[PDB]
Amino acid sequence: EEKAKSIDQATLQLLDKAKQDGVETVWDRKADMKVQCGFGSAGVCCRNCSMGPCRVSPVPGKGVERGICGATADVIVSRNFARMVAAGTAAHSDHGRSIALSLYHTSKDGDIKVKDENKLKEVAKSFNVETEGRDIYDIAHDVAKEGLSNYGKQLGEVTLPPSLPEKRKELWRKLGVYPRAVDREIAAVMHSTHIGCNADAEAMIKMSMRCSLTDGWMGSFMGTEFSDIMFGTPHSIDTEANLGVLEKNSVNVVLHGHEPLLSEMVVEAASDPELVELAKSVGADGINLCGMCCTGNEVSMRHGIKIAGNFMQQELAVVTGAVDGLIVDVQCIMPALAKLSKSYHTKFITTSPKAHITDSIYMEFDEENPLDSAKKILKEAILNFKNRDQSKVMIPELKCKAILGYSVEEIINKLDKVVNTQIGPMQTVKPLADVLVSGVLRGAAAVVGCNNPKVVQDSAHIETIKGLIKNDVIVVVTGCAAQAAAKYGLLQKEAAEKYAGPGLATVCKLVDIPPVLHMGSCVDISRILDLVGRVANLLGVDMSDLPVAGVAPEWMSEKAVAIGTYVVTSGIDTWLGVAPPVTGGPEVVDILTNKMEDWVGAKFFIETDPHKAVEQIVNRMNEKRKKLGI
């Protein structure tokens, strides 16, 4: 009768417990919202000044046509869209900015240090920083200074990655969307969306495209590249996923958020002899560290830390009654966790001055003394195990194995296994390019995205991934979408025979990989751009000429909008499972889902049905294959 809440049995079990406990969840608050405002849902409501609030008609020819200022529905909708990109870009901007500042404070006998010297030497080449006969920390600081300039330089040209084809750069230049400093483009969009500024849908949407580029090729890239320098480049690693990872007799410390420095220090803190003994003093087996959302992906990729769950599972993790400490930093942390943690012994600890949540324990993460600060927070979670009500604990016995760490460096290393020593070249993406041109693999898709109560949890993610791998399309995943697959069991070597098509199953067996490749967090989507870029450069074509696609089956965050925008602007078609608020703007719908193709060689596709989406992705990929002659 009522639509299912989720496809995961562990999620469905804890949802029943939440009802019996009397607590409210995101699914319950969705029902409370009832019918959602159509004006806001169509994007035709404007609040960019105090002359309104204005609400024009989404159906042209009837109702109120213009806003008080004169803005038409297309103007209102295009500005509303722009601001989402600018907000999404800002979330990834501060993320990478913080990583770069950490790189600037690295020392040989310090809490934060350079782990991957080889990666730093390569990154230093792109930023024009010398490496010959110099201290790795002196290079790291000069690189950090050059990287930080990309955020607010007002003169000169910005440094872009080598994987970005020159054809794509020239296309942006001629279109007028070449990126500038990161914070500069955010201000540019915010200024033009102000009352009495831009009133042209095409120009506004182009401003968002320019802004979104500073996220994917600058904010996220540097965030990913510098994280690999300081914490290590990820490689194929095993781990367990789903809420079944929590242990009843151990202290459970769940890390949620996005910033990787705090989670890297809580991992090291879990290995301090004093803290391991304090856990035993309280009556625990040990310290069971778990992750959720990006911060969890960033730790499972590098240290194989177990994943508790994705975005909409964050409330149900507390409902298990086994989370002693829930340490959060920034982004995608539902404020409900403060009210929910009151009904349990769980301690909700906020650490970033960027994300303060009312009625929550606030323990600021001292970046000057990071390891000491991490130990102080972890100690509080350990001591809280004393207040655990073991009789009311209920951790569903449902976990799944998964393989991740599939960075571009790791994928290239694995592809070397299928290269002949006497013929083929080494450490290049050629094996992947060869399989795509031949036609063994119909194409390569990137399923990324969040969880939305408008879609059954994980339903569209699994249906979409399944359908693509069945049609010989290798799938790469990141963020909550990657976790959704890890929970189902698609991130396993044995998933190739079970779900992959004829060609993909052959490639999986030869290269020895699962049919779905976990490439990391949403910031790690820059690795997908890097991979697709290398394939394009190796074949001497632009990214728009390859049979590639991006999918966001379930998405909410303004970050997903910026991600989609920079993916389409980079030349990769993107399918959206959740419809953005553009319905009321006919010109905006035409631009996003049609005219855009003429500007960047790619377009948006809105499809809520995942079965129809895979049909469209395959047909579109084939169209691009026929044009290229492959």
Dihedral pair phi/psi, residue 314, rounded to 5°: -55, -35
23 binds Cl ion (CB under 5 A): yes
Contact positions with its own copies (CB under 8 A) in 311-330: 330
- CA-wise closest residue to 350 among 367, 325, 315, 317: 325
Burial of 418 (0-12, 13-18, 19+ CB in 10 A): middle
Contact positions with ligand SF4 (CB under 6 A) in 48-77: 48-49, 51-55, 67-69, 71, 76
Among the candidate windows 95-103, 386-394, 518-526, 603-611, which touches its own copies by CB under 8 A?
A: 95-103
d(C-alpha 365, C-alpha 262), whole Å: 7
Identity at 258, one-letter amino acid code = H
- CA-wise closest residue to 305 among 274, 349, 266, 348: 266
Q: Which of 216, 244, 321, 453 touches its own copies by CB under 8 A?
A: 453
Site string for its own copies, 109-148 (x = CB under 8 A): ------------------------------------x--x
376 binds Ca ion (CB under 5 A): yes
Among the candidate windows 53-61, 215-223, 256-264, 289-297, which touches Ca ion by CB under 5 A?
A: 215-223
Per DSSP, what are the bridge partners of residue 323? Answer: 252
The residue (of 12 and 87) whose beta carbon lies closer to ligand SF4 is 87
Question: Shortest distance, CB of residue 69 to ligand SF4, whole angstroms?
Answer: 3
Beta strand 323-328 with 306-309 is: unpaired
429 binds Cl ion (CB under 5 A): yes
Q: What is the DSSP letter of 335?
A: T
Among the candidate windows 193-201, 284-292, 435-443, 509-517, which touches its own copies by CB under 8 A?
A: 193-201
569 binds ligand SF4 (CB under 6 A): no
- CA-wise closest residue to 332 among 313, 359, 349: 313
Question: Shortest distance, CB of residue 30 to ligand SF4, whole angstroms?
Answer: 8
Question: Shortest distance, CB of residue 533 to ligand SF4, whole angstroms?
Answer: 33
Q: Which does 80 bind (CB under 5 to 8 A by kind): Ca ion, ligand SF4, its own copies, none?
A: its own copies
Among the candidate windows 278-286, 363-371, 426-434, 577-585, which touches Ca ion by CB under 5 A?
A: 363-371
d(C-alpha 202, C-alpha 212), whole Å: 15
161 binds Ca ion (CB under 5 A): yes
- Spatial contact of 151 and 257, defined as CB atoms under 8 Å apart: no
37 binds ligand SF4 (CB under 6 A): yes
d(C-alpha 261, C-alpha 503), whole Å: 40
Helix (H, G, I), strand (E, B) or coil at 457: strand
Site string for its own copies, 541-570 (x = CB under 8 A): --------------xxxxxxx---------
Question: Shortest distance, CB of residue 332 to its own copies, whole angstroms?
Answer: 4
Q: Which of 7, 14, 18, 54 touches its own copies by CB under 8 A?
A: 54
- CA-wise closest residue to 552 among 572, 532, 582: 572
- Spatial contact of 499 and 469, defined as CB atoms under 8 Å apart: yes
Distance of CA 442 to the CA centre of its chain: 25
Tokens of 385: 């195990």
- Spatial contact of 473 and 443, defined as CB atoms under 8 Å apart: yes
The residue (of 66 and 121) whose beta carbon lies closer to its own copies is 66
Residue given tokens 């949407």 in the structure block: 205
Residue-by-residue DSSP string for 87-146:
HHHHHHHHHHHHHHHHHHT--TTSSS----HHHHHHHHHHTT---TT--HHHHHHHHHHH
Contact positions with ligand SF4 (CB under 6 A) in 72-101: 76
Among the candidate windows 39-47, 145-153, 200-208, 459-467, which touches ligand SF4 by CB under 6 A?
A: 39-47
Contact positions with its own copies (CB under 8 A) in 11-40: 26, 29-30, 32-33, 36-37, 39-40
CA distances from 190 to 54, 584, 593, 627 (A): 19, 22, 24, 39
Among the candidate windows 45-53, 125-133, 379-387, 531-539, which touches its own copies by CB under 8 A?
A: 45-53
Site string for Cl ion, 299-328 (x = CB under 5 A): ----------------------x-------
The residue number whose beta carbon is nearest to Cl ion equals: 321
Burial of 580 (0-12, 13-18, 19+ CB in 10 A): buried
Q: Which of 57, 159, 249, 428 touches Cl ion by CB under 5 A?
A: 428
Which residues are near ligand SF4 by CB under 6 A? 37, 39-40, 45-49, 51-55, 67-69, 71, 76, 195
Residues that bind Cl ion (CB under 5 A): 23-24, 321, 340, 344-345, 389, 392, 428-429, 534
**Contacting residues toward Ca ion, per CB under 5 A:** 161, 221, 236, 363, 373, 376
